[model samples]
Target chain A: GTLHAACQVQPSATLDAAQPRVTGVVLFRQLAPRAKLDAFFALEGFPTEPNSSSRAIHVHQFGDLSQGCESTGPHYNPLAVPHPQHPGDFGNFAVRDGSLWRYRAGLAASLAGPHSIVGRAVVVHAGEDDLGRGGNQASVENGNAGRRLACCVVGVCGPGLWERQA
Target chain B: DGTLHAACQVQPSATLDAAQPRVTGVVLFRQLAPRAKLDAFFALEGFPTEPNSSSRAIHVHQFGDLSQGCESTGPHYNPLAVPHPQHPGDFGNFAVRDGSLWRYRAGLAASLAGPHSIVGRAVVVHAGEDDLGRGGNQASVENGNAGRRLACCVVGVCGPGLWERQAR
Candidate 1:
């Protein structure tokens, strides 16, 4: 099946007043089960200053928004694996001119199965992810990623969004 | 942007056994515009909550026909001719909690707008879990191997009153 899902990124309710109110959407399009999943990022509202810090992004365990992004739980680690190796670990992304855009393919995550990323949360972190190489436990566990900056819940969707985005 | 609302009233299949389970509920929909994201809210009940009870699958079928029960609803709603799980209406699996599957979610592949609209389609609840087309067989790719239809409902346009209240 061609599974398509989207996450409309919203600033964390707990976001710092000083931080940029980042907002955007992440689109997932898998042509078929066992096929490579393609993702597109069209985001804006970042610090426009040169050499700004890159941000970390990952899929969290829950879609609960009782306390906004704070309630999204930890990085989705159904395999009990360390950080960076999890399926939804999207690493760091550099912003350009207050925006971030890119297309990714062949991610380890799946829209199928019990570990499906749908109904989960995608979180953007304030600090860059260390890719599990920091010399501490936090690195192995969460890349010591800083506080949540923005987040959105992934939900099943139709091809309209993907088509219109094209 | 303008807002559009829709609803569906789920009912057990007419062909079911007299002693069979009676599932029922309503699915609410809201869209900000034709090009905007569509959000769906589910409040279904009547599933067995046994310790070993299995998760059920839900999706939008091609037709709203109930003349022969949900069996007449045809296949998954695949306007793009995509496979199962990828269909705009594939709702995935839901685990019953306290005998109900109550949840609020957003960005489903379906819409209440455009040629791909699901307004007149049928939403079907399955008895088995969706294999997500990984069952390693033909049926897997066709329908995620989600077994027999347990209940279904035809989608219809509605005022925002129901959603404005329940979505709060």
Candidate 2:
């Protein structure tokens, strides 16, 4: 099944009392059984100053687990199956920045549809996710996988079969 | 007290397309004698392909140091007369981002206030500022901070007739 989702910038956890300031927002949707995830995150606003590096946002599946503990748990494979040897090993679904992830299984018929992610929660981490086993030193197609940065649970979609107003 | 306000988005000095893009905006405002200085800022979505190492909405300020012209001015000033510093994000009367800009102001006199100075050569730049420091030290006051600018604009009041027509 398929689901549509959107998000807005709620207040941020951090702020400064200076000239220029910064803020952010995240939005996303998920498809289960067939595709694991789909979403978008928009990070904007920085205090108007020189040299201030931009902030990054991340979406994580595993909750607050330290580095050593995280390795024990495999990647998020809603199927309850073994960790696919490669990202494409599972399905088209993928996560980037060690943060956001999206999945899509080729054979739609063999998949469980929407409602699969209904109760399941997705967390925004404080760092990035490195989607690899500790052994290989080879450069993976995925970039410098990091730790979780921030997180949020997926909420139910609001009312209104809501046709597009625009 | 009667005062004027304005905002603008400064595009980077580069080409823009679906793959490579940059966004920025600035809000400028002045306070009458009894009131204090007011300024606001916003940012546009960056290129999805080339995500910057860091990203945050940019803020604007008034009474900035020329030497620190590299930094945008600091935070919004309520009548508090606090020393130059970075106020928490909630302090501002207005805020905006994500497809549209949002604003909040305590005492706006009238929409028809005329003859405001939003045009002409106003010192504006694309530099973001470090609110903590006075635009000189490498460390920001809030925490060790370095400032940067994304865009700049002068303040102005839209004429009543024009403002009304545009609103529609």
On TM-score, the leading prediction is 1
Summarize candidate 1's per-residue lDDT along A41-136 as a digit string, tens digits: 877887788646687889887654435578677888877888888988988887878888888889888876656676567888877899999999
**Residue pairs in candidate 1 whose N, alpha carbon or C atoms collide under 3 angstroms:** A1-B83, A2-B86, A3-B86, A156-B108, A156-B109, A157-B108, A157-B109, A158-B109
The deviation in Å at residue B18 for candidate 1 is 51
TM-score of chain A of 1: 0.94
Error of 1 at B41 (Å): 12
Q: What share of the true interface contacts does each candidate keep?
A: 0.00, 0.00
Per-residue alpha-carbon lDDT of model 1 for B50-85, expressed as tens digits?
Answer: 644568898998765554567867789888998887
How does candidate 2 score on lDDT? 0.29
Docking class of 1: incorrect
User: Candidate 2, which segments miss by more than 4 Å at Cα?
Assistant: A1-166, B1-9, B13-21, B24-83, B86-138, B142-146, B156-168
Q: Which candidate comes out best when scored by lDDT?
A: 1
Residues B1-168, candidate 2: write the lDDT tens digits. 354333232333222233423544333333443243443323333322322233233333332211122132343311234433443222222222333333434343212122221121122332232344444453454422323343332222211222223235
Error of 2 at A18 (Å): 45
